[PDB]
Design a protein around this nucleic acid. Structure first.
Lengths: 154, 161, 163, 141, 142, 59, 109, 148, 175, 97, 116, 160, 165
RNA sequence: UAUUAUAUUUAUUCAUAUAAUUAAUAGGAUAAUAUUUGUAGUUUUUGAUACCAUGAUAAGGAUUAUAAAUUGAAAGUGUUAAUAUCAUAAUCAAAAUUUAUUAUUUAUAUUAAAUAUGUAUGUGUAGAUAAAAUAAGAAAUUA
């Protein structure tokens, strides 16, 4: 794991909105599915999201379905509940992927990026070789060299 | 040489006052930001930092898997499978009228930063501790995964009559 | 030129600039038309001589033809004589291959490094002496294992000057 | 386009106040250069601390075995000689030959500025408080 | 430009913060000269190969009547300290005499020694507007 | 090669049209003699011309 | 980079000129072994749930999933093992929407 | 009508993406020996297109829309535009698929109708915004605007 | 906005955002820029812009002679893809059909009593009978000829040699 | 000849000959190198930090011309060396005027 | 003391990668074990064709000069003392045109001009 | 064919570190080579910052030299052969004709009339077959003759 | 590897053959090629963007030297450097003067040939016409600035100028 | 009403000018002859200048559209063609920041070619602000 400097915190909604660019990054959906097929877990969530985004990509170059001029307006919050179920599906999936990687990194004994919490080894985030001698979120002075996380037998 | 022990005019010049704050215009203070992560809520901090898994890590994991699998070990396996059965149950259909609130318009300019700031500062507070839209707990039944670490096939000397 | 620089004060020096820009004189020759007989009765250039020529000239030849671009002199007649001289001189050079094999130009062979069938013997080379010094160093090592925690080959067969 | 105003006159004697100002400025540069070369060459000849990172293999192995035993049993004199500086350290590693290419591909080395602190430092404030008057391009202690 | 420091401010526009090609500038405003570059002393703002001949404010090429000032392009050498003579650089505003000679200067050009942009600024050339502006950027107090 | 035709070709340089000019490329076969006394195909000398004889400004 | 843990070797080899051993030629799968091995994959990953499961009405049948796998691999064994996995992102499949149209077209009549 | 190179057994069908940067041609050849093989720029397709499924399935799709079997054809995909090191991109694969679609319309015509209908013979009339200095990235963004 | 007529009749005006015709409005219709009854006004009703060039490349390779290529510029350079597929090593062997495919075609032809057809033979047509069938219905399969496979130094040396030998044209041969 | 220097073979022999015919050693003598003058710096030589940064020695540091306060370890000021600066080879041994 | 300081004194000819000073017999693995590991090894060096090995291929190099070959491991370039092109970028012919944007041309000749 | 990133990225506004965004000159671009073009911190534009790590064309030239370094690494790694200057008399027959130089004629065929159009610029010969040529008169052959593999021989490969 | 460039005579081998460095020497003799000897063996870089056809700009010739230590300062550069004699710099020089007629002939010569007199500039005759007219309707605004004043401050023996009104 | 969607994304530390004389034509070898080889009347005017000295081409999106089509305009932004009557200010190197109208490179490896920026580590952090529906992938409150 090379990238160990600081990272930018983006919410799931915008991490998903990047659509088929990185959210439905097919080669990233695949490479996280490989973590699941290694660990021996069912890929129910990532496969659900892949189905949804395959639909969305197939029906991105197309126009929405026509609205009717209803003062009573039902289509609106119905398509709203539809979208926000898709969104909640993807929020769950986002969390599953993050959890599996931050656990598999404690299993491979590999260090995560800076202040990337891994509850497999340390209840707080991994701070080490940082652009600041203070904790980026706790404001705790860093040890030199980077703090050590796993055992020493490799 | 023979560095003079008194300085005439160069050292007397007006002191350029150091930049007070940091960041843009060197004015952005030292106080918490939208970006701060939380270690008290979930195994994945919220908001999380972006991680990136590589094929190096996929192979290291595959090799770790061969070793922990041929050492008779299945305990970290059943830990994996339980931490999977925690968060991978289908979350309920949202109640009709439940929607992520967009930032209300007609306060800031269209290109402002407070629009996305409120979005990030609410998506932070909506932690996994606040995920009430998915089934989690001892109140959930799982008709799709296996109930006890005894139904896993590595302990397959248990179901035999 | 026949638009504008045809006629006045600038006609002269523009004619200069033009014909100097064009002063190049390309000379192409057919190596098959060097494959002739010298009136001495000797073939002017044989296959070995063509080899020496193609190897004397890196990029001047192509598609069985040798090209030299006389770029030196401003006057095209002088590029002509210069290119003729250089061509004739590279010919006199390449013609040494009609003096003996000591001038036949070598070939470049992509001689492969030693393969595995001949790399396998590289562990048994001097197997007798290596196993003997094994049997002796092993006794010094069995001795040493009471002296230090780890017995490196530095105290067995690896040697260094102390200073 | 408004007609650009002529720069007003420079003033009285200021041509010579700038003379004396720059004079004692290069005067001050005399000592600044002296002290800065002092600090840079002590930085150079000082035995530095580890350039690698102990967070990756093969430098995550124990400080007793593997590439560490090779480091103690072939290069332990050379590194102390050449002052642990990451550049000669990595080149002695390239010439040790029994690690292959790994001294880049698998080895993780500290950043350029985490690498150039002297031997055995334990603070994070060292790089962020090194003296800012020694114009070493940060090549001082 | 706006306030014509030279007669060419009368002649050349500004073009805002016009972005320029790397190293192509109609006005060589060596605003970086006096830059102490500790291990790079005989390299930064100096000639490239150490074994070079001198530049050419270093030899009287003809039969001069004399000169009023040398350039910064003439290196500082033993004759610039021991001879103790007058060596002048056309710096702002009129000229700058190297009359306090030292030996550390020996070897480089005088660019690393003639401060291009001064830390002391005379409000005697600034405008009633520029002075408040330099207060704004933190140069003169008020 | 017919120099008379070429004469007829060269004076299109004048009756060409408006704002139109002409560059003539001529690629004509020639005869360059290689010759014995002057350009000898002798053996290598005794003293070998090493890399020193082809240094800068040695040309 | 799917070859980071590959060895920076690039170098050639020759089974005959580089070994005392006798070469046993294990060429690529026929569509035969491809088909048997892949039926095992695509259906036991179900019978253990490691694959599509209750989302099975989205990825195609066997005789088209296999057509896709064998195309994307050229019957290659590794291509098969990894295009049974990249099956997630197969974004040009219409068997299921054409069958859903058949059901929501006939289950009227 | 079928316009197939009589002696050679090939259909030569053109395709393009971005109109400049990707411009390929399919030499699509009939294969009476069931030995499936798809080739791009003289190399095996998996090694060209990086073994990526969502990128090579589009290159398969024409045979699906024609109900034909990829095992009885031979296809080389030639690059005639901005050659690049790596063309494993969606825009490139779309160019490949259009080229193949015209190759198959040219080898078996009546397969035009499914190809027409599926829109494989469709040209996305799209390009980037050209290179402009008035744009900071050259493409879209105009430099910062500021009122007095 | 201007007649439908072969664009080479228009010239883009200077200084005027229009387009005028070099012959002053005198026109010749699309069908003057084509052979009589030319299909899609093609140069030869056989193939399109890329069909012509590549039928030609395959033909030039079939008639390629190396002793003839000398003294010619990049024109005597053979087909880049054909020369390369000829040059490749592992293409010297043509893989046979899979034995399962022989058994499959045979269970159809012997057992199931119907003949399997090549795609150029299967009547995809609906109403009119596609007879006669394409005469290509019997072409061989040469992994040494098509598909185009080759190695990279072949590709590179070929293209850079093509590039550098642009000038080495002995335009005065004795043909 | 036109183009590069590498085609002016007669003119260049000619230039060598003319330049030696006019330019005397009594003029080309004084022309210094950069190093022949840089020699008299109190630190004439210090290895660049690239390679021989591990070859920099303390002994190069002219502490005989500056001074130190031990309470913090800094060199505080520089003695006048332009006074006692006595060189036995003001220009090197090859220089006769 | 010119060689005591490697990077100060670079001739307008000096070129990189700056070759290291040679040890005794670093040639191959046979000679390496013969002199350096097993001083009593049987074989002097890898038995050498009496002919010419143009190791440095195809670069014809000055004999009697100790040279390197183009490296194999992608580490040594990262870990060499090779600089990056900092100042302007010249080519002795292109430098007439002074930049890409202001690319000069004497005559309006075609860019695909086939000079005779 | 190379899934590496050859081009340095356009010098634009600051690419941050989130999903799809790294530092424009982080440690992973060009195997860590962006260390030679990286500077640290929100650089003061007027006074600090190297003027040549802000331009696009020079940084792209550096990156191009580094890509060329890579091509050279892999190319010279790809050699298990060395070029041994054999005289004309002894070289095996495929190297006895007029082989035009590199980039001179089409990369020439080994021999057409013998069913091998194999690259003679890419034909590799083994020492243990050229032994009679080079060190033929040097006593005991430093390598053994090659052991062959018999494909007519009835072994497990012929389903017995 | 660190290999000593060795070259054995055509006499040592028990088959003589022309060796390739000697052929290099014959070629650097024939075409006056400078043999740079500091040329290290580890730097045989080729410009892929220009030599490798997997980029949009494949040229086939190494359109530049992949060598960062480059500049016109070097003699190896100055050797292979096209000089500005008879280049576009000269053409621009000899045809780009502010007025183009002054590049085809001299203005007085052209005037005395086609007309009689040598005419002023359009700008001058503007000034002169304005003189002709603004000294017709009014006077007393002028000045007397000359090149030489000796003849005005000192008129000839006669020439007593008229006082106006 | 219909001939149909902006609430999303990415953004903000911004600077470069210098050392006065603009007034005109003057052909050279391979040509049936010019020393015209070396063509000598000083001093009667004055605007584009340091100074009033007319004109004439930019930046700026908010309702002519979908098909075989481009998401950039006239209202004129320094150099330009008729007002005269303070003064020579014009790059051939090395140069002096106050000028709103600017996208900086972010922690594995940091000075070799005309020299080439030594300062600002800090919870991505006040206020107000920038850009964009165009090969990328956006979806619902018309005047």
């Amino acid at each position: 794991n090379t990238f160990l400097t600081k990272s930018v915190a983006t919410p799931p909604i915008s991490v998903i909105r990047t659509g088929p660019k990185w959210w439905a990054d097919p080669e990233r959906m695949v490479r996280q599915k490989l973590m699941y097929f290694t660990l021996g877990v069912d890929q129910l969530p990532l496969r659900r999201t892949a189905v949804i985004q395959k639909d969305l990509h197939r029906f991105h170059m197309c126009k929405p379905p026509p609205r009717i001029g209803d003062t009573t307006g039902y289509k609106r919050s119905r398509a709203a509940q539809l979208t926000t179920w898709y969104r909640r599906i993807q929020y769950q999936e986002y969390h599953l992927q993050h959890l599996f990687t931050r656990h598999v990194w404690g299993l491979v004994r590999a260090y995560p990026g800076n202040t990337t919490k891994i509850q497999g080894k340390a209840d707080d985030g991994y701070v080490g070789y940082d652009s600041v001698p203070y904790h980026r979120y706790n404001r705790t002075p860093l040890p030199f060299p980077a703090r050590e996380i796993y055992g020493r037998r490799e | 040489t023979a560095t003079p022990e008194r300085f005439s005019i160069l050292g007397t010049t007006h002191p350029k006052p150091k930049r007070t704050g940091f960041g843009r215009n060197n004015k952005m203070r030292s106080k918490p930001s939208d970006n701060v992560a939380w270690y008290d809520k979930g195994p994945v901090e919220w908001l999380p930092r972006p991680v990136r898994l590589t094929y190096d890590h996929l192979d290291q994991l595959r090799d770790w898997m061969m070793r922990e699998t041929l050492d008779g070990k299945t305990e970290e396996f059943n830990r994996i499978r339980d931490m999977h059965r925690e968060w991978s149950q289908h979350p309920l259909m949202p109640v009709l009228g439940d929607v992520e609130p967009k930032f209300p318009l007609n306060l800031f300019k269209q290109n402002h930063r407070a629009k996305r700031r409120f979005l990030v500062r609410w998506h932070k507070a909506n932690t996994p501790a606040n995920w009430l839209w998915m089934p989690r707990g001892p109140t959930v039944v799982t008709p799709l995964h296996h109930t006890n670490p005894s139904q896993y096939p590595e302990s397959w000397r248990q179901m035999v009559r | 030129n026949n638009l504008e620089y045809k006629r006045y004060d600038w006609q002269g020096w523009y004619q200069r600039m033009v014909d100097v820009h064009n002063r190049n004189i390309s000379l192409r020759c057919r190596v098959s038309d060097l494959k002739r007989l010298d009136p001495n009765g000797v073939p002017f250039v044989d296959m070995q001589t063509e080899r020496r020529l193609r190897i004397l000239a890196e990029g001047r030849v192509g598609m069985g033809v040798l090209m030299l671009d006389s770029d030196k002199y401003e006057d095209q007649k002088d590029n002509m004589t210069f290119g003729s001289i250089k061509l004739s001189e590279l010919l006199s050079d390449a013609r040494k291959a009609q003096l003996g094999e000591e001038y036949w130009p070598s070939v470049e062979m992509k001689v492969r490094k030693p393969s595995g069938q001949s790399k396998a013997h590289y562990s048994l080379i001097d197997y007798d002496r290596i196993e003997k010094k094994s049997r002796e160093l092993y006794e010094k090592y069995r001795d040493a294992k009471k002296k230090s925690l780890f017995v490196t080959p530095m105290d067995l067969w690896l040697e260094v000057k102390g200073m | 386009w408004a007609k650009p105003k002529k720069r007003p006159k420079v003033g009285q004697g200021f041509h010579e106040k700038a003379q004396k100002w720059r004079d004692e400025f290069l005067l001050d540069r005399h000592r600044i250069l002296a002290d800065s070369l002092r600090a840079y060459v002590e930085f150079s000849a000082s035995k530095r601390t580890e350039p690698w990172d102990t967070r990756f293999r093969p430098f995550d192995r124990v400080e007793k075995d593997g590439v560490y035993v090779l480091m103690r049993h072939l290069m332990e004199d050379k590194f102390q000689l050449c002052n642990y500086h990451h550049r000669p350290v990595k080149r002695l590693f390239c010439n040790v030959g029994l690690l292959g290419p790994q001294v880049t591909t698998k080895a993780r080395w500290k950043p350029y500025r985490y690498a150039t602190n002297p031997a055995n430092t334990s603070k994070a404030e060292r790089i962020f408080q090194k003296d800012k008057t020694l114009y070493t391009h940060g090549h001082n202690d | 430009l706006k306030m014509a420091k030279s007669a060419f401010g009368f002649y050349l526009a500004r073009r805002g913060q016009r972005k320029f090609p790397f190293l192509r500038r109609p006005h060589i405003k060596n605003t970086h000269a006096m830059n102490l570059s500790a291990p790079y002393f005989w390299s930064f703002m100096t000639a490239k190969s150490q074994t070079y001949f001198l530049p050419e404010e270093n030899y009287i090429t003809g039969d001069w009547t004399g000169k009023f000032f040398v350039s910064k392009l003439q290196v500082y050498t033993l004759q610039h300290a021991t001879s103790g003579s007058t060596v002048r650089v056309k710096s702002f505003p009129s000229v700058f005499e190297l009359s306090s000679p030292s030996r550390w200067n020996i070897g480089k050009e005088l660019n690393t020694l003639t401060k291009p942009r001064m830390d002391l600024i005379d409000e005697q050339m600034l405008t009633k507007k520029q002075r408040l502006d330099y207060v704004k950027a933190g140069l003169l107090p008020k | 090669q017919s120099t008379e035709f070429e004469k007829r070709m060269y004076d299109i340089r004048h009756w060409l049209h408006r704002q139109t000019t002409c560059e003539f490329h001529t690629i004509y076969r020639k005869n360059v003699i290689h010759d014995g006394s002057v350009f000898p195909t002798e053996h290598d000398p005794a003293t070998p011309t090493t890399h020193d004889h082809h240094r800068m400004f040695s040309f | 980079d799917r070859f980071t843990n590959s060895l920076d070797e690039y170098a050639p080899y020759d089974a005959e000129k580089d070994s005392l051993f006798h070469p046993i030629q294990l060429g690529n799968f026929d569509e035969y072994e491809f088909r048997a091995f892949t039926r095992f994959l695509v259906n036991s990953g179900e019978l253990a749930g490691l694959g599509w499961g209750p989302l099975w009405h989205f990825s195609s049948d066997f005789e088209r999933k296999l057509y896709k796998i064998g195309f994307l691999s050229n019957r290659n064994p590794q291509g098969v093992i990894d295009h049974y996995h990249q099956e997630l992102v197969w974004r040009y499949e219409y068997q299921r929407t054409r069958q859903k149209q058949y059901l929501l077209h006939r289950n009227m009549e | 009508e079928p316009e197939v190179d009589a002696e050679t057994g090939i259909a030569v069908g053109r395709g393009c993406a971005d109109g400049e940067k990707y411009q390929f041609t399919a030499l699509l050849r009939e294969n009476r020996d069931h030995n499936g093989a798809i080739t791009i720029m003289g190399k095996p397709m998996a090694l060209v297109l990086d073994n990526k499924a969502w990128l090579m399935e589009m290159l398969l799709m024409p045979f699906d829309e024609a109900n034909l079997d990829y095992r009885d054809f031979d296809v080389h995909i030639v690059l005639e535009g901005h050659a690049m090191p790596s063309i494993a991109n969606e825009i490139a694969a779309f160019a490949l698929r259009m080229s193949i679609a015209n190759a198959l319309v040219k080898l078996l015509p009546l397969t035009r109708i499914p190809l027409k209908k599926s829109g494989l013979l469709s040209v996305d009339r799209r390009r980037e915004r050209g290179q402009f200095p008035g744009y900071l990235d050259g493409k879209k963004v105009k430099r910062k605007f500021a009122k007095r | 906005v201007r007649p439908d007529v072969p664009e080479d009749q228009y010239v883009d005006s200077w200084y005027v955002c229009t387009s005028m015709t070099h012959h002053l409005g005198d026109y010749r219709p699309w069908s003057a820029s084509a052979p009589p009854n030319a299909y899609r006004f093609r140069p030869y009703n056989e193939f399109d812009a890329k069909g012509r060039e590549y039928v030609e490349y395959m033909r030039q390779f079939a008639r390629y002679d190396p002793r003839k290529s000398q003294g010619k510029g990049q024109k005597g350079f053979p087909f880049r893809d054909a020369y390369l597929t000829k040059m490749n090593e592992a293409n010297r062997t043509t893989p046979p059909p899979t034995l399962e495919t022989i058994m499959d075609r045979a269970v159809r032809e012997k057992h199931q009593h119907a003949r399997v057809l090549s795609p150029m033979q299967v009547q995809r047509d609906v109403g009119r009978s596609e007879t006669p069938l394409p005469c290509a219905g019997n072409i061989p399969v040469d992994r040494s000829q098509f598909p185009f496979c080759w190695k990279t130094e072949d590709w590179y040396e070929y293209e850079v040699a093509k590039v550098r030998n642009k000038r080495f044209v002995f335009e005065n041969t004795e043909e | 000849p036109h183009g590069y220097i590498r085609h002016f073979d007669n003119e260049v022999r000619d230039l060598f000959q003319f330049v030696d015919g006019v330019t005397p050693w009594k003029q080309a003598q004084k022309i210094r190198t950069y190093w022949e003058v840089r020699a008299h710096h109190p630190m004439p030589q210090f290895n660049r930090p690239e390679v021989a940064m591990h070859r920099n020695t303390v002994g190069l540091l002219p502490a005989h011309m500056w001074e130190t306060d031990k309470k913090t370890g800094k060199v505080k000021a520089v003695k006048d060396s332009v006074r006692d600066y006595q060189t036995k080879t003001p220009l090197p041994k090859w220089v006769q005027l | 003391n010119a060689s005591k300081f490697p990077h100060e004194y670079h001739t307008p000819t000096s070129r990189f990668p700056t070759t290291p000073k040679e040890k005794e017999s670093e040639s191959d693995w046979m000679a390496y074990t013969a002199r350096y590991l097993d001083k009593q090894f049987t074989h002097p060096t890898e038995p050498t064709p009496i002919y010419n090995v143009n190791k440095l291929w195809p670069m014809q190099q000055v004999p009697g000069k100790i040279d390197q070959t183009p490296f194999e491991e992608d580490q040594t370039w990262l870990l060499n003392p090779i600089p990056v092109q900092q100042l302007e970028q010249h080519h002795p012919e292109k430098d007439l045109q002074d930049l890409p944007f202001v690319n000069h041309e004497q005559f309006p000749r075609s860019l695909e001009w086939t000079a005779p | 064919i190379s899934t590496g990133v050859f081009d340095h990225l356009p010098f634009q506004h600051r690419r941050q570190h989130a999903f799809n965004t790294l530092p424009l000159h982080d440690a992973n671009h060009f195997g860590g080579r962006t260390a030679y073009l990286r500077e640290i911190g929100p650089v003061n534009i007027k006074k600090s910052g190297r003027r040549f790590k802000k331009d696009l064309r020079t940084v792209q030239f550096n990156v191009d030299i580094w890509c060329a370094q890579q091509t050279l690494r892999k190319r010279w790694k790809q050699r298990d052969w060395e070029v041994i200057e054999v005289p004309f008399r002894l070289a095996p027959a495929e190297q006895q004709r007029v082989i035009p130089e590199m980039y001179t004629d089409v990369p020439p065929m080994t021999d057409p009339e013998r069913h091998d159009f194999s690259n003679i610029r890419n034909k590799v010969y083994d020492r243990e077959e050229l032994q009679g040529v080079l060190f033929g008169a040097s006593g005991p052959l430093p390598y053994p003759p090659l052991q062959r593999i018999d494909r007519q021989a009835m072994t497990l490969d012929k389903f017995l | 590897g660190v290999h000593r460039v060795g070259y054995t005579h055509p006499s040592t081998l028990p088959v003589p053959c022309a060796q390739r460095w000697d052929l290099r020497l014959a070629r650097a003799r024939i075409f006056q090629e400078y043999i740079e000897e500091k040329a290290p063996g580890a730097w045989q870089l080729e410009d892929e963007r220009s030599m490798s056809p997997e980029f949009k700009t494949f040229t086939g010739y190494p359109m530049r030297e992949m060598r960062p230590g480059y500049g016109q300062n070097l003699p190896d550069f100055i050797m292979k450097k096209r000089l500005p004699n008879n280049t576009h710099y000269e053409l621009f020089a000899r045809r780009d003067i502010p007025n183009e007629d002054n590049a085809m002939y001299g203005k007085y010569l052209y005037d005395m040939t086609v007309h009689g007199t040598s005419l002023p500039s359009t700008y001058r005759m503007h000034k002169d016409i304005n003189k002709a007219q603004r000294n017709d309707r009014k006077l007393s605004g002028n000045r007397f600035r000359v090149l030489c004043s000796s003849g005005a401050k000192k008129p000839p023996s006669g020439w007593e100028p008229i006082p106006d009104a």
